[PDB]
Design a protein around this nucleic acid. Structure first.
Lengths: 475, 184, 500, 349, 493
RNA sequence: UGCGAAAGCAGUUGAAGACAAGUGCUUGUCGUUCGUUAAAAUGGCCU
């Protein structure tokens, strides 16, 4: 993780996170309920934030600092309003506050009570048997802050006004990470590197329950009357135990489990959820440090939820003004023609020594070699007697082949013209019989209509050629 | 039952009834260079520059005052001469606009808000002649007015300011030219 | 030169001609880098950022000699790319609207003005529209029905334009001309690009068919003959570039104007066919050869009428049985299966040949039941249950020579469930007509007897069509599309807003 | 921990860059792919990648404008005829300066460039300029928000490198100077404020084949300014040859005398100097060579003496292809041919 | 802005008989070579499995030709009298060959020296010897003994099952794709006989009449069989037992037949039929057997085959010709330091957050006339249009759109006799043709209306204009008569 | 210019004013007004 520390404020609208940047730590606050470049850089590279706490009359947050100091920072003006000091120089292991009394466990194993409004180091002690210390919580004893809990690897409760340790519950093997007072009587410890949370009673001083988590625990937030516990599991997952304080019934598993995942399946790691009555507010780091949040409602979430985010993993860069491709949206397009079918408006499709035996063979088959040689024969008496000896249906197909040949070779038009003319002359009657004459003889119709369209320009140009030839021919 | 109404408007109506001056554009980019204001023939649209869409329309048909000003259909000739961004009656409260039409009306409007039915409208009197241009450095504002007694017009140059009262506009004569063929 | 404008430091100058390039001269070495093609002459250019980020420039679309077609441009400066292009609906009216002139050029051609000609021609237009009563400003508009996008055929190019978003969405060139390859300047300005005269959509939505006539440049051997072209275009409903699928040269043979086009009703080939109707009287019927993949003739009808009439209108029975083909002073009803007229075997005066008083401007059918004809003098309504005329109405009061032939077809259409719409146009005067205008719409029921609506418009109306959501849209002079139809929160505001 | 560690490059690192205000790093190679890493010490993560298709990279520059302090750009360039300009949350705003105006015959490739501010002087408005090498002596200067051509300066011979150095004049006034090294050694110093006019020229003593000139000690294209009051004139000048030598001049005395003596002449490396960076406060010169493995040396200035105990024998360096120095935290970031950048902290800062 | 429009080359409306698509592909099949043979070849059989080889019989000689080298490979020549049918197995391993003495031999193809299993059929000749396709080990042979047999090639002492009921000279048999147990047979008396073989087989399951003597039968589906004999052929739908189609557009009798499916073609399926006249004509059962293409090999033709659907190489079409001729038509198909220095170039952006290509993609190059009309030099556009080897379409294109720009006089001012003359030669050809007569009329009209006096002065332009005069008169004649025939035809309608 | 078809058939080119040139005189021009249906300056298209 890149975020060294975090904390929600109460009422879950502003997350304070502290993170490093070219090795000078900076704190920074964000909204979460629907930006902030109002960071706070530390100056030296040798003081680090060691504890965070919010306090509710600006909103201010308290930075227990590795120097041996306690900074109080108003969030609005980026101003460290006041730096209380301990008298000494040791990293402030813990900070807590309730009302106006700030307590800090110093790494001289020592307890300091400061007064906020008075801005003054009130009291200053150490007690026996609290050998090293790591975490602290002052109890809700009403308004009076007596008899607070401090924990090394093993929890201990101490009474202030006589500064004597009153009780002691079996702690953990590792040092405690999380330690919170969950009810009037119950409090949870939970130890770093352990997947376990112990739920103790204060008065009877024995374990009420143990809550396990499917992986190691990293953070913890808890709802109103201990109705809900949302534990941030360091694999990057979020377990909520629903109502852990009622009744095989010592080790409770986790009820619901929430993961977060991008579209293409990549896991994304949650850190530091926040919960309240029916409203869970998770977090994750979207780009390399920037945090993104989400609300959701867990009473009606299903049991194992993989909430999804769209994360622009490999997308293709579209520009707004540019098109899908290269063109830009103030361009007219262009007349592209390509492979359209281009056609006229007269396309009436879809609406005694003869040779007649060779001709009729070729026409019943399609022998272009043989039609070739018979059309090569040229003299007109042969032509007329041949077409007369031909059967008439085959002469219709003769017209078809003849027309195709004229249109593709308009230099043949003479001899093929006498062929088509004599054919028409002889076998006219059958053509009168046939009903859809045009829809058969499109090709002849098309060729002849084209040249007949063409005529008058040729005539006008002939006149103009005659003009110039006469002009320089007379002189 | 059957309803006739206007839905789509068209033309942008370039500053043509000038027919003289060489800077025909009226439409003006914002100060924060993020949105473009186009004066259409029957509305004003606000285009976001970087997303190339229309993020707001300002319809004279919907506003009762604006239809009374512009769309009195017997005389369309109330026609926008200039748009200015920051509001004139107040020094730097923003997102407002002051609109100057052909016959000395200034309208104070908004965008990125809601056009509540109270535009701050003021009228420049003193003008038997016609507004031609309004343009400014800081503070002191200048007015050109087309004017007449060759079939060519005359230009008159005025100095303009405010604070006299909320509807009062100081105008003082500064210059004049008689028959202008071109001006830029 | 139409625009000159400096940069801020005064070392670059932007220049602005008819020649549609935009030229940047750098002044220290008189060097330059233009912007070759732009859709129209640039009437103003300007440098608008602090540091010269954007150049805005107003450009005229000067092809259309009937309006004033501006387009606003805002060019991103680094890239020379259009960060904004702003535009209105651009129809082409019949001839010029109220006191709108043309820009200034070197010569006076049919596209611009010389100087002399500018002053004189402004006088001429003002006088003409005061005096002569003949005037019409009627335009063609189609609606792509699946998209409900208004297709305005500008000359030689369509402008696809929806009206809900008012955002002009495409501008497509639909004829090989000199459309972009150049900028015309002088005698080049005296040239002419082929005109999209008609455009129609099959009811399917996937096919448009268009008719556009080709002009030859003057003073040639062949400066006389136009060449008319039909074209069949397609698209998928996702894509926006209409593709050309069949170009037909010379429908009905040489030099004959396809002056009425009808898309087919869905029954005949799932609405994939069309009628093309000439001015001599001829008919043709094209549809989609589907074993091939293109369009063809299927049915013809060539009557040699020696005579010409530029007013033909037609309509198709919804079952596809028959075709009303109204022609000059005439209406013939045709059997679809034959392209021959339907014979009265009853002989009970259910004849196929109705002769009417004036020319025929419009023939429609509200259902299978009523046929409706607009004639140059009168509006007639006939019912085809029993062959009797039902109603008539007087229009020769308002329609004298006010429109050319067929533009009443584009004024009046019919909704295909309920009723019918008619449109009347007046100009105002005190003591000789002025240039003001005012129209009135009237909605009639299918009986063509009861007036379901009588509304007024304060400026001239140019075209009506029925948007397929059972309403009507109408265009205008002033280009508007009108519709006819039925601790915690105090803390919040601060973070949201946040020498020596 | 290695800055690339999280997303390993596919070609050699060609040009690194630290952002002048935030804690970012930028890397690019012939891989065609900008990568912006958020820099911690422990973890170094990806803020963003971008793969510009078909186009290489051989120079990347972050660029924060000096008046606006929001116009933050990245400029990238390879052996092509164009420059890309990426501006700075889900999709990218990238232009490409493509067209030089009257005259591109003087440059047909955009791969060698720098960016630097400039003042108008008739109004006190400061804009980018982009400086590009060219064909025979030509340096072409473009305005940087709108790609226009400003001015072009020809040095004789052939160019081989060029730096920028700024001079202050009054509050609201600076003056930028362009220094161009011929590969025979003759330095020309144009100034840009009035149109590019030769302030002076002096010869590098010695210097048969020069690659790389760089100034330092003040404000540069490698540690730039953030408001006009902070522009400081550079105290040192260094010139690095392709034999291996590096001459080192003081700016006070070299400007005064106009054919000066190098204060110190370093020869430690043996192959062709291909990087010269000064530290942002100007006390370390790191002179490095692209050409054989482990050729970074860090020089303490003013005493001009090579630091003797780092880099050692085991310093994992490889063929050093690019180097950067961090603006504030005192970090050094080196990138080689395998494509891995490694990152050190000079602990004094 | 806009990219510049390319010039639309002038496509005039289509004339009849246009280059059909199918014709494109089948006319690709070209590069024919001939091989003389000893005697009239009979049967050809492409190896099915790795389809690169084909067998072709002869007189007493079965040859294996190759495919990628189109030469001989191997020769089987141990046969006493002339050998009649040769066919590879399904899997490709074995070749079976039946000869006229009445014995068949099946032996390992590409291994001409292992006469691996010789089955003696009837003492009458066995014209047809085929391997079963669906199974791999039953050799279905025929005979001229009017009785065909299904031998099992494991034990060849007795026909495992027999099919009889012939009338005269069985010389064709076949199997069916989806059915394993149906055998179709074709004799010389019409009468395809369809046998089950799960019953006694002595009687056909049903017969299909074919009045004239059939000579080939091909299963072309699980449901259609094509029967090929006499002048035409006929395709039978088999479940409904009725003939669908019948196509007969040959001259003499058809001889052989082949059907091939799913090769890379616009035609999904093709059926090539061969008809003893040179004519090998190729048809298709998705356009209802309408003739698509045809070759005319010289002599009469006995067999044809195209290389199979899994050719993966250069495909072939062979036809074997009754005077001993094969005609084959075949359609073909640094330093390591340096790289580690410059190793990015082939990345193509796989694991990156955003990917941005905006490179322009290269058009094809512009010709010289398009360059001159891009850059407005009209005079050199026209001179660079009249080129010796330049497409008639292209000259018509530049003349067209130069006229469309409306710069004919402008493109023509500078000229003299020698700058004119090649235009006149082309105008000769242009008026000669019909698509261009309009446009060349425009151009020669202005040459006259502009350059008459120069035309007086020089003598050679007189030569051209006299000759163009006679040409254009003769063109009056050709549209003249062509209008008269429109009169002719209009009377007959 | 009106009618009309793509044809074509009908119809139209007026004064004033001022200025310029040549030399009161000859012609012209027009960022002028009434009155009818009323060619030019060596200069051409980005990557």
């Amino acid at each position: 993780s890149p975020v060294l520390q975090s904390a929600y404020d109460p009422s879950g609208q502003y997350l304070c996170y502290v993170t490093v940047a070219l090795d000078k730590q900076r704190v920074g606050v964000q909204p979460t309920q629907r930006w902030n470049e109002n960071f706070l850089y530390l100056e030296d590279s040798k003081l680090k934030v060691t504890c965070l706490k919010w306090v509710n009359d600006t909103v201010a947050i308290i930075l227990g600092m590795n120097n041996g100091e306690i900074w109080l920072y108003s969030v609005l003006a980026n101003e460290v309003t006041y730096k209380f000091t301990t008298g000494n120089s040791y990293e402030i292991k813990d900070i807590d506050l309730m009302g106006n009394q700030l307590w800090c466990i110093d790494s001289s194993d020592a307890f300091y009570q400061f007064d906020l409004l008075q801005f003054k180091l009130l009291q200053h002690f150490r007690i026996n048997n609290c050998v090293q210390l790591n975490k602290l919580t002052i109890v809700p004893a009403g308004d009076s802050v007596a008899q607070l809990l401090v924990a090394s690897h093993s929890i201990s409760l101490i009474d202030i006004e006589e500064k004597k340790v009153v009780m002691t519950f079996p702690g953990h093997v590792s040092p405690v990470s999380t330690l919170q007072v969950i009810t009037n009587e119950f409090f949870i410890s939970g130890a770093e590197g352990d997947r376990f949370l112990n739920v103790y009673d204060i008065h009877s001083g024995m374990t009420k329950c143990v809550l396990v988590a499917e992986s190691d625990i990293k953070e913890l937030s808890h709802s109103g009357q201990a109705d809900s516990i949302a534990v941030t599991t360091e694999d990057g997952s979020l377990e909520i135990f629903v109502d852990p304080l009622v009744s095989g019934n010592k080790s409770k598993k986790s009820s619901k489990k929430i993961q977060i995942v991008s579209k293409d399946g990549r896991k994304v790691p949650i850190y530091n959820a926040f919960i309240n009555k029916d409203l869970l507010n998770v977090s994750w780091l979207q780009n390399a440090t920037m945090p993104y949040f989400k609300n959701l409602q867990w009473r009606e979430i299903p049991n194992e939820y993989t909430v999804e985010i769209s994360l622009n993993w490999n997308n293709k860069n579209k520009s707004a003004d540019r098109d899908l491709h290269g063109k830009d949206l103030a361009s007219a397009t262009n007349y592209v023609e390509g492979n359209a079918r281009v056609t006229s408006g007269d396309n009436f499709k879809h609406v005694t020594g003869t040779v007649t035996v060779i001709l009729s063979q070729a026409l019943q088959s399609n022998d272009h070699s043989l039609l070739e040689t018979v059309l090569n024969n040229r003299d007109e008496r042969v032509i007329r007697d041949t077409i007369f000896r031909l059967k008439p249906a085959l002469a219709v197909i003769l017209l078809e082949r003849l027309a195709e040949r004229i249109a593709r070779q308009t230099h043949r038009q003479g001899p093929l013209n006498v062929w088509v003319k004599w054919c028409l002359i002889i076998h006219g009657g059958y053509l009168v019989s046939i009903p859809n004459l045009m829809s058969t003889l499109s090709s002849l119709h098309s060729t002849l209509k084209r040249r007949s369209d063409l005529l008058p320009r040729l005539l006008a140009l002939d006149a103009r050629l005659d003009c110039t030839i006469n002009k320089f021919k007379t002189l | 039952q059957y309803k006739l109404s206007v839905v789509s408007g068209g033309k942008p109506a370039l500053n043509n009834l000038s027919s003289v001056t060489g800077n025909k554009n009226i439409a003006r980019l914002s100060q924060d260079q993020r949105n473009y204001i186009i004066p259409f023939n029957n509305q004003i649209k606000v285009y976001s520059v970087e997303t190339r869409q229309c993020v707001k329309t300002l319809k004279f048909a919907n506003n009762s005052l604006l239809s009374g000003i512009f769309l009195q259909e017997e005389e369309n000739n109330e026609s926008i001469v200039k748009i200015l961004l920051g509001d004139i009656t107040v020094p730097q409260q923003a997102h407002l606009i002051t609109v100057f039409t052909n016959n000395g009306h200034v309208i104070v409007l908004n965008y990125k808000g809601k056009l509540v039915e109270s535009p701050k409208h003021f009228k420049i009197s003193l003008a038997d002649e016609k507004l031609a241009n309004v343009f400014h450095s800081e503070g002191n504002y200048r007015i050109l007015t087309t004017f007449k007694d060759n079939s060519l017009q005359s230009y008159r140059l005025y100095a303009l300011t405010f604070d006299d009262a909320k509807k009062q506009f100081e105008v003082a004569h500064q210059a004049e030219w008689h028959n202008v063929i071109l001006s830029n | 030169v139409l625009s000159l404008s400096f940069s801020h430091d005064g070392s670059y100058l932007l220049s602005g001609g008819w020649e549609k390039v935009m030229s940047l001269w750098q002044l220290e070495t008189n060097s330059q880098q233009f912007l070759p093609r732009l859709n129209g002459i640039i009437i103003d250019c300007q440098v608008l950022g602090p540091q010269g980020n954007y150049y805005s420039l107003i450009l005229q679309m000067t092809e259309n000699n009937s309006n004033s077609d501006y387009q606003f441009l805002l060019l991103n400066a680094s890239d020379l790319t259009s960060k904004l292009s702003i535009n209105g609906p651009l129809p082409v009216f019949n001839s010029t609207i109220k006191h709108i002139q043309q820009p200034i050029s070197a010569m006076n051609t049919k596209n611009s003005n010389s100087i002399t000609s500018l002053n004189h021609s402004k006088k001429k237009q003002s006088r003409k529209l005061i005096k002569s009563r003949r005037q019409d400003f009627t335009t063609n508009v189609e609606i792509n029905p699946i998209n409900k996008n208004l297709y305005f055929p500008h000359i030689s190019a369509v402008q696809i334009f929806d009206f809900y978003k008012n955002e002009q969405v495409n501008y497509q060139y639909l004829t090989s001309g000199v459309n972009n390859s150049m900028g015309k300047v002088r005698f080049e300005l005296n040239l002419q690009d082929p005109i999209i005269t008609d455009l129609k959509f099959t009811k399917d939505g996937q096919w448009m068919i268009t008719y556009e006539i080709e002009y030859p440049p003057n003073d040639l051997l062949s400066s006389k003959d136009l060449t008319h072209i039909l074209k069949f275009w397609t698209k998928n409903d996702n894509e926006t570039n209409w593709n050309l699928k069949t170009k037909v040269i010379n429908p009905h043979g040489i030099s004959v104007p396809i002056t009425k086009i009808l898309p087919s009703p869905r029954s005949v080939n799932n609405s994939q066919g069309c009628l093309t109707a000439d001015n001599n009287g001829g008919l043709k019927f094209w549809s989609f050869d589907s074993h091939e993949s293109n369009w063809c003739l299927k049915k013809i009808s060539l009557p040699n009428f020696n005579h010409f009439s530029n007013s033909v209108s037609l309509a198709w029975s919804q079952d596809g049985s028959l075709i009303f083909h109204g022609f000059d002073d005439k209406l013939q009803i045709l059997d679809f299966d034959t392209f021959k007229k339907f014979e009265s075997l009853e002989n009970t005066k259910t004849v196929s040949e109705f002769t009417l008083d004036s020319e025929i401007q419009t023939v429609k059918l509200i259902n299978d039941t009523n046929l409706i004809v607009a004639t140059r003098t009168t509006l007639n309504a006939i019912n085809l249950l029993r062959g009797q005329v039902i109603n008539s109405f007087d229009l020769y009061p308002f329609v004298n020579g006010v429109y050319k032939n067929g533009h009443m077809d584009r004024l009046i259409t019919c909704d295909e469930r309920t009723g019918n719409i008619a449109l009347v146009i007046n100009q105002q005067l005190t003591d000789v007509p002025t240039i003001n205008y005012k129209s009135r719409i009237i909605i009639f029921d299918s009986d063509l007897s009861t007036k379901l609506g009588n509304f007024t418009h304060h400026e001239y109306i140019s075209w009506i069509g029925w948007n397929y959501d059972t309403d009507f849209i109408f265009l205008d002079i002033e280009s508007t599309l009108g519709v006819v139809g039925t601790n915690s929160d105090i803390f919040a505001e601060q973070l949201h807003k946040l020498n020596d | 921990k290695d800055a690339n560690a999280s997303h390993p490059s596919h070609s050699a690192i060609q040009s690194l860059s630290f952002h002048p205000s935030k804690p970012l790093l930028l890397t690019g190679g012939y891989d065609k792919t900008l990568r912006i890493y958020h820099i911690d010490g422990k973890t170094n993560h990806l803020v963003t990648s971008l793969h510009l298709v078909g186009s290489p990279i051989q120079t990347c520059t972050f660029y924060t404008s000096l008046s606006n302090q929001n116009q933050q750009n990245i400029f990238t360039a390879g052996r092509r005829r164009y420059m890309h300009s990426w501006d700075l949350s889900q999709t990218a705003k990238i232009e490409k300066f493509s067209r030089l105006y009257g005259h591109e015959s003087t440059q047909r490739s955009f791969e060698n460039f720098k960016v630097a501010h400039l003042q108008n002087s008739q109004t006190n408005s400061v804009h980018g300029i982009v400086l590009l090498q060219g064909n025979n002596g030509w340096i072409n200067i473009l305005h940087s928000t709108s790609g226009l051509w400003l001015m072009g300066c020809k040095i004789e011979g052939v160019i081989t490198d060029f730096c920028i150095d700024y001079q202050p004049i009054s509050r609201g006034k600076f003056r930028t100077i362009l220094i161009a090294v011929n590969a025979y050694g003759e330095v020309w110093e144009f100034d840009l404020n009035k149109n590019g006019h030769v302030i002076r020229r002096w010869k590098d003593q010695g210097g048969v084949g020069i690659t790389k000139i760089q100034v330092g000690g003040g404000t540069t294209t490698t540690c730039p300014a953030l408001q006009i009051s902070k522009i400081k004139q550079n105290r040192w000048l260094a010139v690095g040859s392709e034999s291996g030598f590096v001459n080192l001049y003081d700016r006070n005395n070299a400007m005064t005398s106009s054919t000066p003596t190098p204060v110190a002449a370093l020869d430690q490396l043996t192959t062709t100097i291909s990087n010269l960076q000064f530290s942002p406060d100007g006390q370390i010169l790191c002179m490095a060579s692209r050409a054989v493995k482990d050729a970074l040396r860090l020089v303490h200035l003013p005493s001009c003496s090579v630091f003797s105990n780092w880099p050692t024998s085991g310093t994992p360096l490889g063929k050093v292809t690019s180097v950067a120095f961090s603006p504030s935290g005192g970090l050094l970031a080196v990138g080689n041919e395998q494509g891995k950048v490694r990152l050190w902290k000079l602990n004094h800062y | 802005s806009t990219a510049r429009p390319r010039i639309i080359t002038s496509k005039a409306p289509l004339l009849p008989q246009q280059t059909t698509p199918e014709q494109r592909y089948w006319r690709q099949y070209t590069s024919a070579q001939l091989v003389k043979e000893h005697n009239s070849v009979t049967h050809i059989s492409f190896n099915p499995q790795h389809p690169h080889d084909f067998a072709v019989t002869s007189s007493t000689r079965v040859q294996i030709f190759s495919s990628r080298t189109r030469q001989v490979i191997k020769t089987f020549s141990r046969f006493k009298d002339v050998v009649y049918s040769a066919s590879f197995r399904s899997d490709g391993k074995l070749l079976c060959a039946g000869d006229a003495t009445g014995l068949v031999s099946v032996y390992d193809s590409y291994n001409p020296r292992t006469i691996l299993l010789s089955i003696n059929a009837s003492t009458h000749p066995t014209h047809v010897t085929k391997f079963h396709t669906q199974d791999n080990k039953i050799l279905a042979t025929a005979s001229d003994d009017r009785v065909t047999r299904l031998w099992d090639i494991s034990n060849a002492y007795e026909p495992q099952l027999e099919l009889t009921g012939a009338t005269d000279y069985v010389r064709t048999l076949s199997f069916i794709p989806a059915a394993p147990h149906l055998v179709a047979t074709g004799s010389y008396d019409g009468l395809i006989r369809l046998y089950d073989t799960r019953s006694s087989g002595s009687t056909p399951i049903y017969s299909l009449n074919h009045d004239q003597p059939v000579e080939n039968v091909i299963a072309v589906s699980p449901t259609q069989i094509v029967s090929c004999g006499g002048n035409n052929f006929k395709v039978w739908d088999l479940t409904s037992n009725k003939k669908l189609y019948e196509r007969g557009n040959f001259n003499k009798a058809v001889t052989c037949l082949d059907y091939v499916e799913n090769f890379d073609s616009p035609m999904q399926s093709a059926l090539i039929a061969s008809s003893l006249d040179g004519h090998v004509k190729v048809f298709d059962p998705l356009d209802n057997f309408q003739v698509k293409f045809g070759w005319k090999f010289s002599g009469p033709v006995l067999s044809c085959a195209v290389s199979p659907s899994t050719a993966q190489g250069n495909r072939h079409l062979v036809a074997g010709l009754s005077s001993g001729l094969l005609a084959i038509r075949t359609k073909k198909k640094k330093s390591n330091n340096f790289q580690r220095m410059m190793r990015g170039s082939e990345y193509q952006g796989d694991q990156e957050h955003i990917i941005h290509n905006d490179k322009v993609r290269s058009q094809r190059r512009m010709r010289a006339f398009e360059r001159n009309i891009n850059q407005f030099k009209w005079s050199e556009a026209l001179d660079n249009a009249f080129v010796p080897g330049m497409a008639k379409e292209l000259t018509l294109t530049v003349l067209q759109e130069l006229r469309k720009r409306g710069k004919v006089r402008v493109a023509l001012y500078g000229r003299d006799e020698s700058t004119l003359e090649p235009l006149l030669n082309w105008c000769l050809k242009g008026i000669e043709d019909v698509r261009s007569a309009s446009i060349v009329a425009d151009w020669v009209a202005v040459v006259l209306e502009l350059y008459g006096n120069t035309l007086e002065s020089s003598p050679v332009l007189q030569e051209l204009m006299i000759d163009l005069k006679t040409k254009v008169r003769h063109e009056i004649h050709k549209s003249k008569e062509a209008q008269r025939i429109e009169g002719m035809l209009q009377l007959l309608t």
